DNA sequence: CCACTTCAAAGGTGTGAGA
DNA sequence: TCTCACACCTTTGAAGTGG
């Protein structure tokens, strides 16, 4: 049946083993990596709308200090739920397969009253992306482990920082 | 440069999501009702055409 | 119609200050 | 911890030129 595949794994695993940090600010803060996907199993003439999700890893606090996270409280009431609908929605299965699906203008805000429905996260916990295909009782979920992150303010884990500026275009006046 | 509108984008690019090609007063329609020249139609959706690809 | 180009504006990076 | 203005980059996208 249906089948998903996570464009760029690769580079996303170098980041899934330092611990994935993600910046959320007020404004909301793009993905780095961006969420890519290819989809195949879809009836093509049949109509779909492709949500993203993002859901709690665990239910910890963390804490970076001497260059290790630390589980340091149990995760506090997060936050308003929110989901992040495809643009291209809804779309034939034929539209989606075509090529990649691809979820980059996504954004991520701190903000608990934000007026932009962007997806709202709270700092230093471990969250998990999931992609959720619905037909417009059904609709089929897939996660990609490595996709998994922390939600941060600023970049924590120095290692991580670099990781970001030698493999993001956007960042490229700091790099040697 | 002038951009268009946040209106305008908005119609042109549902329109695209039904037809992806126009005829020739189609374009004459859908450029009064944006208000923009019908060249800057018909070259909006051949950009578009390129461009998701 | 398509193929590609042109080249400012729009806008995404981490920084490092100052809360 | 969080926020914000920079500097410095990319992408965007209407318009250009030729097939």
């Given at each position: 049946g249906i089948k998903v595949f996570l464009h760029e794994r690769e580079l996303w695993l170098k980041f899934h083993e330092v611990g994935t940090e993600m910046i959320i600010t007020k404004a909301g803060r793009r993905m780095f990596p961006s969420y890519k996907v290819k989809v195949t199993?879809?009836?093509?003439k049949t109509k779909y709308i492709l949500l993203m999700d993002i859901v709690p890893a665990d239910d910890h606090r963390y804490k970076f200090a001497d260059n290790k996270w630390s589980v340091t409280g149990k995760a506090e009431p997060a936050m308003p739920g929110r989901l992040y609908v495809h643009?291209?929605?809804?779309?034939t299965g034929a539209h989606w397969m075509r090529q990649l699906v691809s979820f980059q203008k996504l954004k991520l805000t701190?903000?608990?009253?934000?007026?932009?429905g962007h997806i709202i996260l709270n700092s230093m916990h471990k969250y998990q992306p999931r992609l959720h295909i619905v037909k417009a009782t059904a609709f089929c979920t897939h996660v990609f482990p490595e996709t998994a992150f922390i939600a941060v303010t600023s970049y924590q884990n120095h290692k991580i920082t670099q990781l970001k500026i030698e493999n993001n275009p956007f960042a490229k006046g700091f790099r040697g | 440069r002038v951009l268009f509108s946040q209106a305008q984008v908005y119609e042109l690019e549902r329109r695209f999501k039904q037809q992806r090609y126009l005829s020739a007063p189609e374009r004459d329609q859908l450029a009064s009702v944006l208000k923009l020249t019908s060249t800057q139609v018909k070259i909006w959706f051949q950009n578009r055409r390129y461009k998701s690809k």
């Open positions: 199993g879809l009836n093509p643009p291209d929605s809804p779309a701190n903000n608990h009253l934000d007026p932009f | -």
